[PDB]
Design a binder for these strands. Structure first.
Lengths: 70, 156, 259, 88, 66, 129, 225
RNA sequence: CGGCCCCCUGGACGAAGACUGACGCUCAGGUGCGAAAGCGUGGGGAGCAAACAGGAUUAGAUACCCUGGUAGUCCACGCCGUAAACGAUGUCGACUUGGAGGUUGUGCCCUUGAGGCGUGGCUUCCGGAGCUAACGCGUUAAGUCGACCGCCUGGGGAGUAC
């Protein structure tokens, strides 16, 4: 996330840009992930579980949507 | 003209904040002494009411059964849930050789002569259902002839 | 018999997929829903806003015929994509007509450049063009009487992404998105883009030849958090948006609307 | 695997028609050659278990083929086993 | 909306650095097939190419390193 | 592997009956053909049609009376794992005579009743009801 | 009676998208144009005719017909159809157990009738404003629900339906009691509960209207007979 | 089983043809492969960390938390032969409504465009008939059948003793 302040650019704006860049990188997230050792099994489980959740969100909810709430 | 037999009555409970709410289930079966049979399963806080309900249920949703004279037309198996039931036609005089719930259904149906064993579960409600199924599926000679595109003498 | 088979291939022959054949007769009007029947499986729930012309009031009663569009079938119940896009093809045909005689003539009136090219509006629609296209020379329509009447002489068109810059006054004078993503880049180039779907965090305005923009929720207005983008703008509408940010790598051009 | 040219050569020799390729004897020969080739490999690479599985399978197939040959036609089988030098 | 299907390329080239550069991050990372919309078959190839490039110092492993 | 062709055929027939299929096709065999013929005679199927020279396909045409299927039940009895041979006195009665039992005898494949009439038993192929 | 050309014009031949189909409607389907299922008009028409005939016959013996259509697009139209041949209808949401649980619903009907009487024949007025309002609301509710079936008395001797999948509850009820069912059944719907299936476009308004009109005519004819 | 490269090497799938001509399926004993930990001999040892030590916490804390930390994890060659070694679902074959995908081929089609119409392999989810104690399974069956094998017979005692 290397950044250079442009000529006649505000500080705040620059900071914001930097933040955005960082977010894009996913650096903080990566750091968080590597704080502690995740057993392979655990890693697998999370990934599959997450996937399942995503699938549920996509399809079941869509089905629900077809019918009106009131 | 219709005869009606209460097979079983069982007390069933529902747990609530206070304690246990009790109720009664009545399993009945009704028949006209000919092909028509129908079981009914009624439920109420008091027994008699439950029984009445069961009877009412039975009286509607009856079912016809092809009976060669006093007995069945051929050996027939009937299953429902745990209860699997075998029943076999038998010679005049032998009577209804069958156990429990099964017997009752047969009696109302106006079968007089059967050899019938209930394998598996003997949970009255299931077994009666099984029996009914068996009766229902059982085809006559005429019916079979119709199905197959033949006369009755061709089938024997 | 084969009467029906022949009738089927006949009816295949006498329809096409896009909004091309002006076939749906308007068979019920109620504000705010028009509805047609172009020989499809169901009737369209048409907005009223695909059919009022240039000052706000309706133009077509019962029996009237506009084609709509297609290639999308059954979202649950219903049939179409809107006929207004239909219109875009007609506009494209008129723009194309230029090529034949090397001069398309209508009226173009362009007051100012959102992103470096005066905006030109033809009939109901208004389009944005690159900065040169508005003026033949360095004349500049800022000194011209405001929203002046000329025509449009075309300067530049982008041919994939739809941006057309046209020539006001001077009558006498006569893989693919992502490599060179530096055209609308530089900090704040305003664009005219139709929104597609508003995902309760976003609005997804994306027009410039196979890209994706967001204008997510933070700008959109001059209130931050209580906004809910479906209330505040539209569905399917061409708006004020500019880039504010491009990543040509993780294709996220992050446009804005508070400008 | 066995090189194309080598395979062709094998086919020509053992096969009667030379276009045949699927003759039992020919097949056996092909198998045998492959096995021979793989011996060298497996001397070097003793822990290559997965590869060895394939070899084993091939061997089994060859054996089966031989058996088939035996019941059908004994003389031919004998000839084959002389040619290849298969102890059985 | 894959590029390589349309171009109809037989194999992605690590030497073709410019092309690669579209699929790499500002931070050097290879961009996901969700974002680029690259076909799966091609994506792997692209990744491989990028890796190769990195080995040959044609592309950088990361923005920071020096 | 395919071990019992007759059984397979029977299964196919059953499935057709279940699924309301008009006709059921399979690879032909002489025994199978005979069985089909027998069935036709006894009136459980409409017609059978073998077709082909190199690898011929038997096509049975299933029967449906008042919505439901005609072949109510159809079980193999003899099977490669465990063969069943009956003497003319020991020959069964399927559904107390209402169904039929295909039995292969020295004088060709026939229904149980037919076999009885003849005065000979044999390998019991299948019960059909 | 109803011609093929007319049907085509209406948009009967159109069905639902291919992913929403029922494979029990595979006999009644012809093909798939632009990834949308086309109903076979050659197989539809005779069936439709038969259905019409049946309806007529029913009418002739003084049969009570019930017209069900709670789509909300063709709610207006179904009511109209019903009224033309002075028959009964359910154009708004079908009350679960309308027919199976008639004896309870008969009380509701009675109540509604009473309310109506109070409104109209009494001419008393002089009622507390909130209470009056409440009463009015109740009346409105009843009218919406049971307006068409208030004069039905008992159970209907046949049941005409505009969509089988949408009105499955009604259909089911009719099966439990054994009332003949005359359902318009698009490709997505299930025809197994229906006695006299009519393969046709439930969704399109013009088609629905057409379906209604012929039926109405036949009923009228039966009545006349 | 996961950076990249090379060398040796096993299987799978498709496309057409050509050939062989039942050579097949299953398999008690038998043979092999078999995570992690563990063992032996010789190397290696960054990080992590059973054991161990101290600091906390606590009524206690032979734990959880913290600071350290050795076997081990890594390599070579042997042994061990077990795991919720799981889809808690033996292998092989046949047959029975559908939908939405993913992946990897391949035939035709104006690829007029990212497409259009098929046809094969493997695969994720939903669901019909049927099945099921129900939960659920549902063309990758737990459906309908056939072939072979393995295994179960109340809980504990015990997968223990001899």
């Amino acid at each position: 996330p290397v950044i250079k302040v442009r000529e006649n650019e505000p500080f705040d704006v620059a900071l914001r840009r930097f933040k955005r860049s960082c977010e894009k990188a996913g650096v903080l997230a990566e750091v968080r992930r590597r704080e502690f050792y995740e057993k392979p099994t655990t890693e697998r489980k999370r990934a599959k579980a997450s996937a399942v959740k995503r699938h549920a969100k996509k399809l079941a909810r869509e089905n629900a949507r077809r019918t009106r709430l009131y | 003209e219709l005869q009606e037999k209460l097979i079983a009555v069982n007390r069933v409970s529902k747990t609530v904040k206070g304690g246990r709410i009790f109720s009664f289930t009545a399993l009945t079966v009704v028949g006209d002494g000919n092909g028509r049979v129908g079981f009914g399963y009624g439920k109420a806080r008091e027994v008699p009411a439950a029984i009445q309900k069961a009877m009412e249920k039975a009286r509607r949703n009856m079912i016809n059964v092809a009976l060669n004279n006093g007995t069945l037309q051929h050996p027939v198996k009937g299953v429902h849930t745990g209860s699997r039931v075998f029943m076999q036609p038998a010679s005049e005089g032998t009577g209804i050789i069958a156990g429990g719930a099964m017997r009752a259904v047969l009696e109302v149906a106006g079968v007089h002569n059967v050899l019938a064993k209930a394998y598996g579960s003997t949970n009255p409600i299931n077994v009666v259902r099984a029996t009914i199924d068996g009766l229902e599926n059982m085809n006559s000679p005429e019916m079979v002839a119709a199905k197959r595109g033949k006369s009755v003498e061709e089938i024997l | 018999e084969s009467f029906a088979q022949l009738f089927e291939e006949s009816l295949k022959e006498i329809e096409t997929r896009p909004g091309s054949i002006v076939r749906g007769v308007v068979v019920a009007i109620d504000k705010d829903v028009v509805l047609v029947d172009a020989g499809l499986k169901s009737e369209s729930a048409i907005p009223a806003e695909q059919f009022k012309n240039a000052q706000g009031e309706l133009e077509i009663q019962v029996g009237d015929e506009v084609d709509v569009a297609l290639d999308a079938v059954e979202d649950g119940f219903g049939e179409t994509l809107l006929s207004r896009e239909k219109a875009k093809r007609h506009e494209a045909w008129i723009t194309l007509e230029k090529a034949y005689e090397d001069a398309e003539t209508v009226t173009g009136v362009i007051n100012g450049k959102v992103k470096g090219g005066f905006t030109v509006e033809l009939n109901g629609i208004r389009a944005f063009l690159p900065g040169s296209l508005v003026d033949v020379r360095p004349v500049r329509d800022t000194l011209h009487l405001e929203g002046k009447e000329l025509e449009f002489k075309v300067i530049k068109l982008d041919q994939k992404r739809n941006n057309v810059v046209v020539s006001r006054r001077a009558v006498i004078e006569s893989e693919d998105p992502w490599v060179a993503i530096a055209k609308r880049y530089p900090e704040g180039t305003k664009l005219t883009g139709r929104v597609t779907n508003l995902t309760d965090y976003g609005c997804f305005v994306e027009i410039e030849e196979g890209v994706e923009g967001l204008v997510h929720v933070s700008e959109m207005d001059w209130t931050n958090k209580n906004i809910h983008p479906s209330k505040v703008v539209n569905v399917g509408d061409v708006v004020e948006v500019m880039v504010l940010d491009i990543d040509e790598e993780r294709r996220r051009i992050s446009l804005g609307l508070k400008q | 695997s066995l090189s194309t040219e080598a395979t062709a050569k094998i086919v020509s020799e053992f096969g009667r028609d030379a276009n045949d390729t699927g003759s039992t004897e020919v097949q056996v020969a092909l198998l045998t050659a492959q096995i021979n080739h793989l011996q060298g490999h497996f001397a070097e690479h003793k822990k290559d278990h997965h590869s060895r599985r394939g070899l084993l399978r091939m061997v089994s197939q060859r054996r089966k083929l031989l058996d088939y040959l035996k019941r059908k036609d004994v003389a031919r089988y004998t000839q084959l086993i002389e040619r290849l030098g298969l102890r059985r | 909306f894959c590029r390589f299907t349309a171009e109809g390329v037989q194999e992605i080239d690590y030497k073709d650095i410019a092309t690669l550069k579209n699929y790499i991050t500002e931070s050097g990372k290879i961009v996901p097939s969700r974002i680029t919309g690259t076909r799966a078959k091609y994506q792997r190839q692209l990744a491989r190419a990028i890796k190769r490039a990195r080995y040959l110092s044609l592309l950088p492993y990361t923005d920071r390193h020096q | 592997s395919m071990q019992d062709p007759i059984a397979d055929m029977l299964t196919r027939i059953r499935n057709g009956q279940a699924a309301n299929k008009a006709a059921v096709t399979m690879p032909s065999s002489k025994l199978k053909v005979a069985i089909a013929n027998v069935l036709k005679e006894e009136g459980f199927i409409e017609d059978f049609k073998v077709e082909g020279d190199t690898k011929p396909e038997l096509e049975l045409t299933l029967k449906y009376f008042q919505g439901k299927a005609v072949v109510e039940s159809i079980q193999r009895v003899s099977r490669p794992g465990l063969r069943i041979y009956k003497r003319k006195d020991e020959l069964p009665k399927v559904m107390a005579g209402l169904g039929i039992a295909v039995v292969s005898t020295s004088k060709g494949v026939m229904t149980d009743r037919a076999a009885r009439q003849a005065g000979l038993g044999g390998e019991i192929i299948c019960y059909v009801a | 009676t109803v011609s093929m050309r007319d049907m085509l014009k209406a948009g009967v031949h159109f069905g639902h998208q291919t992913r929403y189909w029922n494979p029990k409607m595979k006999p009644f389907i012809f093909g798939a144009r632009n990834k949308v299922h086309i109903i076979n008009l050659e197989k539809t028409v005779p069936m439709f005719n038969e259905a019409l005939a049946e309806l007529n016959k029913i009418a002739s013996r003084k049969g009570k017909i019930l017209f069900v259509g709670t789509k909300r697009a063709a709610s207006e139209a179904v009511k109209d159809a019903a009224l033309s041949c002075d028959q009964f209808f359910v154009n708004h949401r079908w009350l679960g157990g309308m027919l199976t649980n008639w004896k309870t619903v008969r009380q509701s009907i009675k109540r509604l009738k009473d309310l109506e009487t109070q409104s109209q024949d009494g001419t008393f007025d002089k009622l507390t404003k909130k209470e009056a309002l409440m009463r009015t609301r109740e009346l409105e509710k009843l009218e919406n629900s049971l307006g068409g079936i208030k004069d039905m008395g008992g159970l209907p001797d046949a049941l005409f339906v505009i969509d089988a999948d949408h009105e499955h509850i009604a259909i089911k009820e009719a099966n439990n009691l054994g009332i003949p069912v005359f359902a318009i059944v698009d490709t997505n719907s299930d025809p197994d509960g229906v006695d006299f299936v009519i393969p046709g476009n439930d969704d399109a308004i013009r088609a629905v209207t057409l379906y209604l009109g012929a039926v109405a005519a036949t009923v009228r004819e039966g009545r006349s007979q």
